[PDB]
Design a binder for this molecule. Structure first.
Ligand SMILES: O=C(NO)c1ccccc1
Ligand SMILES: [Zn+2]
Length: 257
């Protein structure tokens, strides 16, 4: 099945998932000089105070911190969004080296990693129905650079040893995603897709301009994870990022002047 290796990586996905060569695929390079300030954008609202995390899972591609989305708790609204989007999970994409790892790039610059906080449009009832709609999902993307440690990420880092291989999960309650956000909410937004198969084009991307810094030690632990399952040859979970795709007929809007 699909992965990030030479024989099943991004360049191969289109065979099982034709939409890989679609009209609004993600990620894309964000050309900052071509992005235009949009005064029609309303202020962005990230309300994560009532967030209820449940567990963490190694799915063989990345690790997902899942949340209880059966109620109106952690929601994203405002900005380019119409309505309320509910947080269902977050995960990261990272590299084997600090010089690569992010999916979106800024003026071709690659960051060490990228955090994706996934939300679904409540007007559609649930995540499954949402992914059949062009405005069913909203993903808040945050870049990670290596520098000072991020205190709010350490709880995630310390539980990774317990979910080293594909299929493993661990209880992960009371984790506050507010500790992963940078100070500024300035962002770029464009219509795109999931960056992993099935690559569905149901996403409104909101990529924050300000990256958060994490320590070399923190990202090093991300790289100790495994793509393989327990009892299988070890294949380090690194470089699980899809490269920038053609922007095609799209414009990236900026929330700032
Ligand atoms: O960011 C994602 N993949 O990398 C993603 C986004 C929405 C739903 C599932 C996955
Ligand atoms: Zn992602």
């Amino acid at each position: 099945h699909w992965g990030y290796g030479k024989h099943n990586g991004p360049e191969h996905w289109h065979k099982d998932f034709p939409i890989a060569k679609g009209e609004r695929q993600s990620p894309v390079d964000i050309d900052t000089h071509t992005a235009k300030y949009d005064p029609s954008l309303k202020p962005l609202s990230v309300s994560y105070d009532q967030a209820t995390s449940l567990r963490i899972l190694n799915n063989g591609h990345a690790f997902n911190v899942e949340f209880d989305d059966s109620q109106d708790k952690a929601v994203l609204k405002g900005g380019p969004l119409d309505g309320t989007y509910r947080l269902i999970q977050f995960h990261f994409h990272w590299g084997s080296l600090d010089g690569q790892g992010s999916e979106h790039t800024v003026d071709k610059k690659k960051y060490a990693a990228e955090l994706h906080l996934v939300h679904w449009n409540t007007k559609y009832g649930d995540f499954g129905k949402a992914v059949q709609q062009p405005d069913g999902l909203a993903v808040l993307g945050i870049f990670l650079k290596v520098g000072s440690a991020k205190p709010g990420l350490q709880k995630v880092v310390d539980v990774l040893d317990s979910i080293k291989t594909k299929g493993k999960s661990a209880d992960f309650t009371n984790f506050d995603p507010r500790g992963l956000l940078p100070e500024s909410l300035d962002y770029w937004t464009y219509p795109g897709s999931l960056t992993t198969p099935p690559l569905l084009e149901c996403v409104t991307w909101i990529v924050l301009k300000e990256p958060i810094s994490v320590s070399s030690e923190q990202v090093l632990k991300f790289r100790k994870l495994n793509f393989n399952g327990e009892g299988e040859p070890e294949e380090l979970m690194v470089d699980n990022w899809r490269p920038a795709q053609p922007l095609k007929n799209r414009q990236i809007k900026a929330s700032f002047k």
